Symmetry: none
Subunit: 99 residues, 12 copies
């Protein structure tokens, strides 16, 4: 808690990247992110913007990550299938010598 991401200094996101029988799928945990201003633009960069809590509004519990969230991915980058379901950004991308 109290660890947010400035627009200049963002916060990294969790993700599980695995290869199935013939797919290369990454899954980024992205809950409560409804802003279509999130930009998943050699490398694939995933960016999202979750709003910040009002300091004047007195909430008795403020324990959740908010702000700017980003993650760069060094890796066919043309036909990728992105799907947002249940708050999960699912991105689907396609020696025996010795001495």
């Amino acid at each position: 808690q109290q660890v947010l991401g400035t627009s200049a200094r963002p916060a990294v996101m969790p993700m599980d990247a695995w290869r199935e029988g013939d797919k290369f799928v990454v899954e980024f945990d992205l809950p409560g992110i409804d802003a279509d201003s999130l930009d998943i633009d050699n490398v694939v960069t995933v960016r999202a913007e979750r709003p910040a809590v009002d300091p004047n509004r007195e909430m008795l519990a403020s324990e959740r990550p908010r702000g700017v969230f980003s993650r760069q991915l060094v890796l066919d980058t043309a036909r990728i299938a992105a799907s947002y379901t249940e708050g999960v950004l699912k991105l689907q991308i396609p020696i025996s010598i010795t001495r």
Copy 2:
């Protein structure tokens, strides 16, 4: 976190006029494991994220297991007309609802 020793989940609890709202973050949760079974005293939210696919070894940074949270509040909120919503991997809970002398 296992069932015996559960892990804590994030939440934000704020009072919004007529409705007190507390929101948990449970992304990609299957409903067969999400259970908030409790009585009138407290409000316990339990949920289970499945372990990694045993046949699918990956190159694994997302937390999984059992996440639980106990909310101890007063007798004010009516526990009968509670409203729950699971949207965008968010568990939004909406529960509806003198002074003392100028200190010496």
Copy 3:
């Protein structure tokens, strides 16, 4: 600590006969920011201490400031009506009779 994420405050609680005494430390607090919100059986103590100007150059900044809050879960033994509160020497002594 801001109003969203408050910083806790110290307190000493002891049962003195038929008078359960709690003691909070609030040195130098204006009464307009002090708010003792009480509900069914929980006593919520909130107070606001002003913040330092970031541009004002002070040689030492060691005193904690901001929003200080503390929730008190009380059993059904103390009467939430009759209560006596005092503020002496920057001390918030609350006194709740019991049964």
Copy 4:
């Protein structure tokens, strides 16, 4: 480290819910019943025990066992029967069994 009456030290506990009996277990090895006091009403169940301290002048070889006042505050819901509580002390283990009084119709929340 060491728990005093004003600042008590926490004690280990294992709590599990049997079908008919809700069980809590506290680890209190070598405790005298004269100091062991489960004094509380039917609201919050607080276990307070006291283990005597060591003489600062006595010269022991190894002082590794924790001593002093141990206390644990347990907040229970409205499901446990308060009067018919059972308590036992076996092999330095304080086993407490509390029956559960469940309601006829439970609540299932819609989403």
Copy 5:
């Protein structure tokens, strides 16, 4: 903190025109234990807060107690004679004119 090994106290120092102000936080302190010992150019602030009875059973012990001390090395700009000290709301505001 005991008298041999004292625990430090918070303070805020700022130069207000010809009045250098220091502010110590001493909530609930009896004046018989407060001792402001001054020497050549060093201002030593000492205060004693009583300790809790170890045998008295209190449900919460969170407030720091014992001997609180603080040494202040001051330059040759402030007059060590004319000084004005106040204790309001558990606050020890010392005010030393300058040159």
Copy 6:
């Protein structure tokens, strides 16, 4: 049993009898094993259900005691009462 956890122990010299005390609350005597040979005493003990709390430590507990030549290792008295394993070895 490969990586054991350590157990608390208070030892003092009571005149003719040197006494060591271990805290083993709620231990089955079938698992309590005290293996000693020559001048070293080895104390070994052994102790997903949606539990409300699981604060008590469990598993294999062990303690390795290197003793001097001042105590007779053959005549050693041991008792287990109130969850305490008290061992007294004369001088």
Copy 7:
């Protein structure tokens, strides 16, 4: 295999051969696998004790050990020479 442990390696540039050494103490060669991409070279190896064999002390790190080495374009990727001597995997890559 999913979450591997890192290996100790040291790389120095010989006059004509850049040499990187890995510490692989007692890894069965059937588990040793050197999979190299275009300009990166990944060294993987597997080395766990069976629970029915009760050990008095287990301190050696076991499991999956891996390392992903990002190399420059100045090294030829075809004629690399590896050896496994005294539990050291000596990789010698010419230039």
Copy 8:
């Protein structure tokens, strides 16, 4: 992290004593002289500089450089000449040279 005017951040410094000149060095890369203020009397030498902050709305790729108010309080003995101090700023390095005014007869303590 970030130093403000009320809570300033410390700055690195290397101080060594030459035979004739006592030298102190501060690391202030990319500092504007309008904010750099060595304002103090002949008692304690305090170096106070200010580096502008970053716009919270501007989207940078990496924000790793420390910014804000940097301050350093230096307590010196009665050996340094106060008036004839030399100050320079070269390659983001604040080099300060202060002559030393030693006494004729020094003290050697007996034990």
Copy 9:
């Protein structure tokens, strides 16, 4: 030079020019070496006397920058002013 320390750096995209800034105060230009080949930029710099204080970090400082295919690696501008190594690479 085997185990180098990392240096601070602020990078941002200024329209046609992507600018990265390193803090190298009081560095000799003979030791400042910027080795770059293909799409990776490597920045390397090098910086008992009874001193009163030795708070300034010294030794070998290095930084490894992995860049994308969006910038031309041949035409890169560099400057060293006020102890700051500013490198601007066009898009």
Copy 10:
């Protein structure tokens, strides 16, 4: 040599031979020395890079490695059998 680093070892009791294994990746045998006392056995070995050979990355632990093993009286101290295979120093002590 004065302050040595510890070694990873694992010991298990075979049916008739208690075996303890050490990880010694690429230690020249001239520096390997096994000095055993009455009932204790001390394994010492030496493995440092020269400064004139500039390395791009140095991560392998080097220097003096040692281990003092306190054994019981149930092991015969005369007919021990040691091997150094795949950088593993396998000590086999009968009973």
Copy 11:
């Protein structure tokens, strides 16, 4: 600092043990220990007792180890030469197979 040794729970002492051309000498750092009640009694145990500071006496600096100091040494134990000089307890005591 503030780390002392109870008579029951003592504090360990530093020592340098080395073998010369024909000696086995251990050197224990023991400054300001003048009590002859210090007892250096298969194993050699070194014990010493340094007095404790008075809590009532207000000292402005109390940063040094005091109290009970002990150290056990597992090792001809008959003719040993002990010497205390400059606050230093100097104790002087006298396979090529593979596969």
Copy 12:
């Protein structure tokens, strides 16, 4: 600790009537390295413990190197008649030597 970056040494400074006493702990210190050279403003105590014998490798828990300590006090103590003693590895230093309104 080296000469550039020295290590701190323990001490106890208490006011004993006519004499203010501050004691340092320097066990087994050779006098050729112990030097407390300072002026009237502060009191700086420096001492150097020799590094381990290069020809004598041991099986080394005693700290060595350069230990220094700076004592900043007021102008009260007379810096002329200071008394120093080195006994039992202890450096005992003996230096000889209005109110304000009841706070509002």
